[PDB]
Design a protein around this nucleic acid. Structure first.
Lengths: 100, 117, 55, 51, 88, 271
RNA sequence: CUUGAGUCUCGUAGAGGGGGGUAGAAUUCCAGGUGUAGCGGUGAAAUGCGUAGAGAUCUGGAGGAAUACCGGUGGCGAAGGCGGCCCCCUGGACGAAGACUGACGCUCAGGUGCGAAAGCGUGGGGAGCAAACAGGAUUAGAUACCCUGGUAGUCCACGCCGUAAACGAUGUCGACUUGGAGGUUGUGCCCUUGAGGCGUGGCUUCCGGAGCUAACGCGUUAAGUCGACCGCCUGGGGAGUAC
RNA sequence: AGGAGGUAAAAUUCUUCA
RNA sequence: GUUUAUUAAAAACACAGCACUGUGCAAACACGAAAGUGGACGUAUACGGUGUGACGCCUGCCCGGUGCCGGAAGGUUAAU
């Protein structure tokens, strides 16, 4: 059970479903006695370059202490979900707070 | 025919010939002109002056649309890289923007070799 | 520098074109140099730091 | 790379290229691929950067 | 590389007590543990040669350790091979 | 899976089997079977119109659906069967209504998948839908030329088509032959590739290995006599004639394509 | 018995290795709109390409392969060798103290395993590049250098080949021997009160001592000074060939 | 002063012993 | 293996394999004045023609004549 950054961006059209994503996500994690130290939602933020057409996406920061199991089967949900655009999990090194 | 005012100057200077094409804000090309098309064969067109007259050649063929101002996107090094944009300005065109669009790959394709001279 | 999210600190370590500035100018430290570069690489992917100014 | 001049001038004044791209990284990836040969070149030049 | 949970667990089964991981039985024990763990690791991929010499080094290590133990006290040798399950 | 038999005997050492473990073993689905006799290369006049047709092992037909009209109705692939009539493998899928139909089992197909057809079917192998809804570039097999007819393009094994154009109500498809023919997007198609691809890795091994398939021996024009074949008979391996058919038709380059009807539906011939 | 060699707790750095995905740029191919006799190429030209509309330009899509900048006598590994990003699995090395095992060590014929590129077998794929080959130039001659095209190959899965200037042309391990300038990775102490100050280890780079050597040079990482073990040489050609 | 970029087209052969 | 049933059973023919080429479906081709049918109730890993003839190493030089596949300024040119 290690930490994972996790910082995906949902399509601007599916912004009303975003608040729901965090629900199932946090639920699936807590289901396996997972953890959670930080969860931020910068909201519809500007983009650096025209990614998959359309400008400005909906970013949603994350920080969970889930095992290297439920986290591996997490990207499969993102890839399958055409709603979300990008996705990335990074390092571990203990947990953090606020910032950004 | 037509009557635009804002266009673009897509030039492509190389180590051999320099092609200049004045298009619109949509990129459909209104008129072009090469350094070789106006004569100068071989090293003759491989010079900055070849591009100078070339620009004037493209200019005296696109003014029919009343092109007041137009952007300029340079592409490809070699001669006629600076003298080219130095012509349109003296031709009577209102230079606005000048951006470089030289194809720079992040190391992908394999370049040639044969050059032992 | 010590992170990638702190773009407010990595925006002054890169040229206008986005190219990572060498330690020769920034005068940055050793271990801190690669870390600074490693942070930029992560930011770029997350669309935090444009790879080029062409955009 | 790009330049957005003011008003009181027409001269290029775009000497930014002579400090980044232009040919500083274009001429390099122009001819042969070199590969391992560069090391000897840089090592040779670096040996002359001392005195 | 073998969780610290299993390591300390094995040490408290071969040696007289804790902190006695230096014991020959403890070493050969903690070594075989990996040899059996990585055993399944190589079962997959099978193209990992760099990490292959490591596993071989581990076995070649305990092997020499066995000859030593067998050299000194023979009883401690048998009570180890039959328990740990090896040598055949 | 490919297998290379050992030289246990002559005509068996040059054999390369192409079996498949994920292939059903037994009798097919009776409800989807029929007579399907064997002509023999002869027509109603009993004249052998097509030469080299005869013998072969007894075969049966498999009711395969190429139209795929069952839209909005999911289906699960029960198993994969062998279809002698074709070179590709068929898949006995079972829809949620209880109806079973055969379809060209795609490359990435397995037993227990959920395929479906319709202008709402997800872009994946095994699904069928009009090219007007299928993204450009998407590799598709069993393409149709007319809306409602049925898949007729890329039906063999390992073969496939690739949509690479739109414009109007048509789309240009890159046939496996290398030709790009235009077809109205109104025509449906099935994403992904066709069946197996190891079908071309076969080499039989012996002559008799081609007899029970439906092919008969081949005779050369040089071996035959002039009264039989234009290449004459000769008096010791002779020719002096031009490579033509046994009916007086130039070959080895001589094109014989006359249509002018579908030439418009053509962009660039093969090469 | 513990100083050699290991284990244990915690922590740190890394193009180390293997597997599975992913993103952007560019080139090529293809499609649409606009546009029209040139394009392309060289030292100069030509072959080639183009009125079935190229090149150029704008937009979109597919595919392959490699990852610009970072990037450096910088880092890692036994050597070969190894560069985007992320996940999973995993080897080894190293450091701060203490504790434990207690020579359990070093090397090592046979044998065994690994091992760039090229090549080969069974398949797939194949943008670019590119032996052979084809067509133009150069030339006294051009089966070459140059240009236009282009197959095998390069890529991927599996099974072989085990060959190189496979070099640092120096085998590996341990001990000892004046120093100076840097790189890189931990750690102790001090108004942390300067981004540092004052020390102590591992590794690496250049120069320079004694000494050594035929000289060139090497020079605390030795080719210095010694010890252990294994391999190897006895003129060149023949030949890394014959049996 | 430091750094970066640019800058050359082909042209064979010469006995043996002192 | 096949073949001159009834003087030739052979180095001939066939042969898996390989190669070139034609073929985008109402296919090419073939039987037919036509309809129609076969090819195929198949779809380029398919089919037809030709050539050679397991495999192993390989398969060079040459485009005038005679053909095939394209383009094309000028010239000649039927019926109307």
């Amino acid at each position: 059970m290690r930490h994972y950054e996790i910082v995906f961006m949902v399509h601007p059209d599916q912004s009303e479903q975003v608040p729901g994503m965090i629900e199932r996500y946090t639920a699936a994690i807590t289901g396996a006695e997972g953890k959670i130290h930080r969860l931020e939602d910068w909201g519809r933020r500007q983009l650096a370059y025209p990614i998959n057409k359309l400008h400005k996406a909906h970013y949603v920061l994350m920080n969970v202490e889930a095992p290297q199991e439920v986290i591996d089967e997490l990207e499969t949900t993102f890839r399958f979900n055409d709603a979300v655009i990008r996705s990335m999990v990074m390092r571990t090194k203990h947990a953090v707070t606020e910032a950004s | 025919r037509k009557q635009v005012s804002d266009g673009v100057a897509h030039i492509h200077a190389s180590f051999n010939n320099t092609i200049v094409t004045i298009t619109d804000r949509q990129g459909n090309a209104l008129g072009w002109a090469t350094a070789g098309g106006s004569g100068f064969r071989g090293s003759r067109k491989s010079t900055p002056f070849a591009a100078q007259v070339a620009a004037e050649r493209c200019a005296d063929a696109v003014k029919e649309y009343g092109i007041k101002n137009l952007e300029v996107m340079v592409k490809g090094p070699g001669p006629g890289r600076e003298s080219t944009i130095r012509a349109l300005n003296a031709a009577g065109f209102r230079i606005t923007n000048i951006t470089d669009v030289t194809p720079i790959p992040h190391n992908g394709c394999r370049p040639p070799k044969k050059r032992r001279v | 520098e010590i992170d990638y999210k702190d773009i407010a600190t990595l925006k002054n370590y890169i040229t206008e074109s986005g190219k990572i500035v060498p330690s020769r100018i920034t005068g940055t430290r050793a271990k801190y140099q690669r870390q600074l570069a490693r942070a930029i690489k992560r930011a770029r992917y997350l669309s935090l730091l444009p790879y080029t100014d062409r955009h | 790379i790009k330049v957005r001049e003011n008003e009181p001038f027409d001269v290029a004044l775009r000497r930014f290229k002579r400090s980044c791209e232009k040919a500083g990284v274009l001429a390099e990836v122009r001819r042969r691929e070199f590969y391992e040969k560069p090391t000897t070149e840089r090592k040779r030049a670096k040996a002359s950067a001392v005195k | 590389s073998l969780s610290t949970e299993a390591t300390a667990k094995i040490v408290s089964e071969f040696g007289r007590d804790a902190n006695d991981t230096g014991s020959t039985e403890v070493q050969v024990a903690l070594l075989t543990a990996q040899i059996n763990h990585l055993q399944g690791h190589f079962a997959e991929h099978k193209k990992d040669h760099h990490s292959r010499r490591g596993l071989l080094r581990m076995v070649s290590q305990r092997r020499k350790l066995l000859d030593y133990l067998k050299r000194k006290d023979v009883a401690r040798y048998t009570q180890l091979i039959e328990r740990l399950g090896l040598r055949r | 899976a490919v297998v290379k038999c050992k030289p246990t005997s002559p005509g068996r050492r040059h054999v390369v089997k192409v079996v498949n473990p994920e292939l059903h073993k037994g009798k097919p689905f009776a409800p989807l079977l029929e007579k399907n006799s064997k002509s023999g290369g002869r027509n109603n006049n009993g004249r052998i119109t097509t030469r080299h047709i005869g013998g072969g092992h007894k075969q049966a037909y498999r009711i395969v659906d190429f139209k795929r009209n069952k839209d909005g109705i999911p289906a699960v692939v029960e198993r994969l069967e062998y279809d002698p009539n074709r070179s590709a493998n068929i898949a006995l899928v079972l829809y949620k209504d209880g109806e079973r139909r055969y379809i060209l089992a795609p490359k990435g197909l397995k037993a227990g998948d959920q395929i479906q057809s319709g202008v709402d079917a997800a872009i994946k192998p095994g699904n069928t839908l009009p090219m007007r809804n299928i993204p450009v570039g998407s590799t598709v097999h069993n393409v149709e030329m007319k809306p409602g007819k049925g898949g007729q393009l890329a039906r063999s094994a390992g073969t496939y088509v690739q949509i690479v154009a739109r414009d109007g109500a048509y789309v240009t498809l890159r046939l496996r032959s290398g030709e790009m023919r235009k077809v109205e997007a109104d025509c449906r198609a099935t994403l992904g590739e066709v069946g197996n691809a190891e079908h071309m890795l076969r080499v039989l091994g012996k002559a008799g290995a081609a007899r029970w398939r439906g092919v008969r021996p081949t005779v050369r024009g040089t071996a035959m006599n002039p009264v039989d074949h234009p290449h004459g008979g000769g008096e010791g391996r002779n020719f002096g004639k031009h490579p033509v058919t046994p009916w007086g038709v130039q070959t080895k380059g001589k094109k014989t394509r006359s249509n002018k009807r579908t030439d418009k539906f053509i962009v660039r011939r093969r090469s």
